């Protein structure tokens, strides 16, 4: 008597913020990509192959150079590997043997790594004995984490099991902000390029925006029929691409909230793992249950290019910041870059 | 559930801060974009094998 | 930090046999490259040897090819060196350098403090003269010139630059001509074509006083400059 | 081209070995996946073996075992089940003498959580084992609380071989996963055995398809 | 007479057939390999060996009919028979290890996890290579008649050699099959973790190869044992010279045929002998279907609809 009615007055609300959406886009992108060339027929070749470790690869992560990433995996290694010599550098152990988050510092001082034990661990690569040893632990927390990122050198934005994303402060040990508007268990975030405000999304088939200075929430996102399994932010930082279960890649603008198109196409089954632009756009690379993996236009969204590098589920996808190359990899203990 | 109750309604209100503008100035900026960045972003734009340093 | 003391020379008679250690402490010999690095006691700075993190590659001077060798022992974390037939041209102030070589990384990082071991082609490049006159608050300028430029086909200048304090070990000052090094100022810079070199230092104080080289990573002979001696 | 990628590629060599080295040492234990529920006798099993996840590591004979207990994790299965995807055994854990205790039997709810594990595509064929607890609590307090649809007799020995075998009926369409039923006193010597003679046939047969013979 | 052209027809035709067959399987092999195993190693080995057993002989026999009568000076006729009687050596003693490795890995699953080097096979079948050429070679060496003599029928002291050389190379593979087979018997009869058909498929598969082996060889083995147990009466033999060693030579040259036709087809008896049923040939029509593109339907519907 009066819980559904205020569940009526934010159904209402909801259609006006739906009205703006049909309204704000008078004509949706997919409609006016008539006049843009397409990008064409890219065949993407492998001037190198990431070869050399054992187990499942889950995750990996580009540096501001563009030329070192970061490879992280079920085995319990962080390498460092090179763009060009394919000579990696670093292999750090793991006290948990399972995890599935990582992220290097755009200095490339620190990097972050993180299991499914609630645990976030911090190393510094750049030391005076030359070795990579624990700068601190996160902790703090209880479930498992899904993704970390470098807001800055010391402040991090985690997102867990918990329902709850945190900002933390290295120096200190302790949350400077909490996050509970979700009720679902978070699984991936991407960070604003301005690095002031982030987007969340959850396995409650929706995703929140958030303030660093008020630590409250900002906007919300909805549409999607199950959990969203991946999210990126597009580098001109007022739109963002998600991809769930429901094998249907979407493009919300942060300024706009409204859904553009929903990228799909029904020979389509296979469920998105993984999400991502170029510098300047144009495509939008992403990673489906089938192994051959796909790139899409981040306009047109028709078939631009199909990468039939690996034989197994595609764990991760990257882009360099330059926009000169991208790197993949998948179950299968291998990573390969395409020019 | 009261408590929560509460809690759903001041989030509810502190989100209907909301922004509204157009979608195709959007349009505007990756279009600066292929003008600028994808001048020098390969994948749009190929860049001939000599500046490339994968070769 | 670290210590990378000697266990300490004598007179070695000519022509004889000895054997020297560099006692290493709080880093990781096994995974740490190095390097003996020689310093005429009168004037001069020139190489010994050379031991790579997996005892793969061990590389030597022209004379120290035969007559002296190099090996570690990790589980106590220490370095022997053999020398055999010691003569006047290798008798020298034997400075311990460390170094790790890999992607973005800073070799000779370290250097130790030496022996006061006294008995009894290739690339050469040179400086402009080894005694510039100098006055504090004012910038100058010294220039290492080589015969073939260091411009590899990467692109990378191989050069280093080290400070040799009165009577302690040198340490670095610019790596790569363009990159500085960790515990330094900004006033030391690096310039100059692939051909000449140069190292422009400002602000003169009573902190900056000694003797300065010039390096070569280029090949195989890590040959060091003639060097100058920054006088007062 | 000079001796700084020599270098590099000496180091790289020396990662490439030490990387081996791991994999082939690490490459010798067993995974165990426990899957206890509740007051399933958690802590009468690590005692006779003997925030997050717990790692426990045991020896027997010249085997070693690596189990990963999963407990109080509250979050949706489907995210974290395929990590244990490389599991050789799955361990399950339930009482029988919590038939009179309703939060909806816990022992109806217990068999979708079996059923619904053994039906999953990624554990289309794993080895899976079913242990049992509170036997004499069971045996003791014994039927129409729980199951009135036997209506059979009250002794212990027919009423305990229903209750097992309708645990291992629902097996679904997965028969090719056999179901180690075992009668856990929870006062045994060693149930371990239970679980190592049921691996090392198993390891047997996991050589025959590589073998060739079978 | 006819009957030398009815045999280099059928011996000319099973070496041509054995060609497309070795050479498919070889690729099969190259295919497996990729996700193969350490008998997919030992059978790489064997299918070389194989396609080394393609068959020269079957032209020296078409154009001059055997006869001694070479033309090479007696020089490559003798490195065609080393050839051919090193791949059969090397063919049984790989039959033999993969039974030794078959038993190690069934008996000693658990000190079995110490072959996984991936390099001993190959380090093991290398050692046997060099002991059959060192064994081989001094036969070589007495056999200095480079001149036309007979191989079979020969004097005392030469056909000792070959009497040496064949026991040690019949005795001993079919002793440490049968010791393998046996002890593999003896432990899963004790075995009872596996239901009770499949222990009877395995078993009867493992007496199945040996028992075509056996009777694959067999021939061979009995005329060889006749011919050295009458060398080894070396006072008198029982019967005259003439008389034996095979002097009804129609039925020496169609024993040797049918033997060559068990010795080739190695990897189609290998395939047989372990499942006379199997999908992976299915999977394998599949993948020549896809590469090759012969099915001519879509052309065919077009020139039925596109008239109209
Ligand atoms: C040269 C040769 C090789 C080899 O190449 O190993 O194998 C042979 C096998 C048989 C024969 N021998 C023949 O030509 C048949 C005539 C014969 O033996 C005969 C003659 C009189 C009475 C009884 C028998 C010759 C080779």
């Not at chain 5, 068990?262 to 199997?278: E, F, K, M, Q, W």
Request: overall charge neutral; aromatic content about 10%; charged content about 20%.
């Amino acid at each position: 008597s009066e819980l559904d009615q205020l569940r009526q007055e934010a159904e209402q609300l909801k259609n006006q913020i739906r009205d703006a959406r049909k309204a704000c886009a008078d004509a949706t992108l997919s409609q006016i990509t008539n006049n843009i060339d397409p990008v064409g027929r890219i065949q993407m070749r492998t001037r190198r192959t990431l070869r050399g470790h054992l187990a499942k690869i889950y995750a990996m992560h580009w540096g501001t150079d563009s030329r070192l990433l970061v490879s992280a995996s079920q085995d319990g290694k962080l390498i460092i590997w090179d763009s060009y010599t394919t000579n990696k550098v670093h292999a750090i152990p793991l006290r948990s043997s399972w995890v599935m988050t990582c992220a290097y510092a755009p200095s490339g001082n620190y990097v972050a790594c993180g299991g499914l034990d609630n645990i976030c661990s911090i190393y510094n690569l750049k030391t005076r004995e030359g070795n990579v040893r624990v700068s601190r632990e996160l902790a703090g927390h209880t479930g498992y984490l899904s993704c970390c990122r470098f807001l800055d050198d010391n402040q991090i934005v985690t997102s867990s099991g918990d329902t709850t994303c945190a900002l933390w402060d290295i120096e200190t040990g302790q949350q400077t902000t909490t996050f509970t508007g979700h009720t679902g268990d978070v699984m991936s975030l991407s960070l604003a390029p301005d690095t002031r405000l982030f987007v969340s999304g959850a396995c409650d088939a929706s995703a929140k925006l958030w303030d660093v200075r008020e630590g409250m929430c900002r906007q919300t996102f909805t549409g999607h029929e199950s959990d969203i399994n991946a999210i990126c932010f597009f580098p001109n930082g007022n739109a963002f691409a998600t991809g769930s279960d429901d094998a249907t890649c979407r493009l919300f603008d942060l300024r706009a909230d409204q859904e553009l198109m929903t990228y799909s196409h029904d020979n389509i089954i296979c469920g998105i793992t993984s999400v991502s632009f170029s510098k300047s756009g144009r495509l939008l690379l992403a990673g489906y249950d089938d192994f051959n993996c796909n790139v899409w236009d981040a306009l047109k969204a028709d078939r631009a290019g199909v990468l039939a590098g690996h034989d197994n589920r595609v764990s991760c996808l990257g882009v360099t910041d330059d926009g000169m190359a991208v790197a993949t990899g998948s179950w299968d203990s291998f990573l390969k870059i395409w020019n | 559930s009261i408590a929560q109750a509460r809690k759903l309604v001041e989030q509810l209100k502190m989100e209907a801060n909301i922004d509204r503008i157009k979608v195709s100035k959007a349009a505007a900026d990756l279009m600066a974009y292929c003008e600028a960045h994808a001048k020098e972003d390969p994948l749009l734009t190929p860049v001939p094998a000599s500046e490339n340093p994968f070769r | 930090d670290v210590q990378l003391v000697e266990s300490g020379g004598g007179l070695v008679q000519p022509g004889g046999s000895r054997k020297l250690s560099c006692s290493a402490s709080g880093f990781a010999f096994s995974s740490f490259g190095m390097h003996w690095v020689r310093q005429a006691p009168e004037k001069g700075l020139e190489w010994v040897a050379y031991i790579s993190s997996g005892s793969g590659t061990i590389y030597y001077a022209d004379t120290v090819k035969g007559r002296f060798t190099i090996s570690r022992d990790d589980p106590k974390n220490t370095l022997f060196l053999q020398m055999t037939s010691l003569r006047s041209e290798d008798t020298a102030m034997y400075y311990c350098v460390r170094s790790i070589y890999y992607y973005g990384s800073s070799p000779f990082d370290f250097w130790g403090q030496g022996t006061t071991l006294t008995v009894s082609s290739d690339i050469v490049m040179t400086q402009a003269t080894s005694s510039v006159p100098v006055t504090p608050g004012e910038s100058v300028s010294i220039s290492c010139r080589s015969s073939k430029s260091l411009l590899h086909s990467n692109g990378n200048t191989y050069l280093y630059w080290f400070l040799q304090r009165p009577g302690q070990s040198p340490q670095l000052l610019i790596y790569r001509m363009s990159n500085l090094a960790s515990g330094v100022p900004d006033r030391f810079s690096g310039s100059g074509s692939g051909t000449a070199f140069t190292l422009t230092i400002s602000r003169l104080e009573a902190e900056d006083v000694g003797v300065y080289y010039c390096m070569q990573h280029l090949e195989y002979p890590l040959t060091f400059g003639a060097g100058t001696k920054l006088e007062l | 081209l000079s001796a700084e990628d020599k270098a590099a590629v000496e180091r790289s060599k020396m990662i490439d070995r030490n990387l081996r080295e791991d994999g082939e040492k690490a490459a010798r234990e067993v995974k165990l996946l426990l899957l206890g529920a509740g007051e399933s006798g958690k802590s009468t099993i690590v005692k006779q073996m003997k925030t997050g996840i717990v790692e426990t590591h045991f020896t027997f004979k010249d085997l070693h075992f690596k189990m990963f207990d999963v407990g109080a994790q509250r979050s949706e299965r489907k995210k974290w089940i395929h990590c244990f995807e490389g599991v050789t055994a799955i361990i399950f854990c339930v009482a029988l003498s919590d038939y009179d205790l309703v939060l909806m039997n816990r022992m109806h709810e217990s068999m979708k959580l079996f059923d619904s594990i053994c039906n999953n595509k990624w554990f289309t064929d794993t080895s899976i084992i079913l242990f049992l607890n509170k036997k004499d609590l069971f045996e003791e307090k014994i039927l129409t609380i729980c199951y009135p649809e036997y209506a059979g007799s009250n002794t212990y020995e027919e009423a305990a071989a229903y209750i097992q075998c309708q645990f291992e009926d629902l097996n679904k369409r997965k028969d090719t996963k056999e179901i180690y039923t075992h009668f856990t006193c929870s006062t045994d010597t060693k149930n371990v055995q239970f679980v190592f003679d049921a691996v090392t046939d198993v390891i047997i047969k996991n050589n025959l398809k590589d073998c060739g013979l079978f | 007479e006819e009957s030398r052209i009815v045999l280099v027809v059928v011996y000319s035709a099973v070496c041509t057939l054995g060609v497309p067959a070795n050479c498919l399987t070889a690729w099969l092999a190259l295919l497996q390999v990729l996700q193969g195993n350490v008998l997919a190693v030992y059978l790489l080995c064997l299918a070389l060996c194989e396609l080394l057993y393609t068959g020269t002989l079957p032209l020296w026999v078409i154009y001059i009919r055997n006869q001694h009568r070479w033309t090479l000076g007696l020089l490559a006729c003798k490195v065609t028979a080393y050839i051919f009687f090193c791949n059969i050596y090397v063919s049984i003693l790989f039959l033999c290890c993969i039974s030794c490795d078959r038993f190690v890995a069934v008996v000693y699953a658990l000190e079995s996890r110490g072959r996984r080097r991936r390099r001993t096979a190959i380090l093991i079948s290398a050692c046997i290579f060099i002991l059959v050429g060192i064994v081989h070679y001094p036969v070589f060496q007495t056999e200095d008649k480079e001149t036309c003599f007979d191989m079979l029928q020969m004097d005392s002291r030469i056909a000792g050699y070959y009497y040496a050389r064949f026991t040690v190379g019949f005795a001993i593979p079919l002793s440490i099959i049968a010791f393998t087979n046996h002890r593999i018997f003896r432990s899963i009869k004790q075995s009872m973790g596996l239901s009770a058909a499949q222990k009877a498929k395995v078993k009867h598969s493992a007496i199945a190869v040996v028992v075509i082996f056996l009777v694959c060889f067999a021939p061979y083995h009995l005329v060889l044992l006749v011919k050295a147990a009458a060398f080894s009466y070396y006072r008198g033999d029982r019967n005259a010279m003439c008389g034996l060693e095979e002097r009804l030579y129609t039925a020496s040259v169609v024993f040797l045929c049918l033997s060559t036709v068990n010795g080739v087809a190695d990897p189609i008896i290998y395939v047989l002998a372990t499942d006379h049923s199997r999908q992976e040939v299915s999977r394998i029509h599949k993948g020549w279907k896809e590469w090759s593109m012969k099915t001519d339907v879509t052309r065919l519907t077009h020139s039925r609809d596109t008239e109209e």
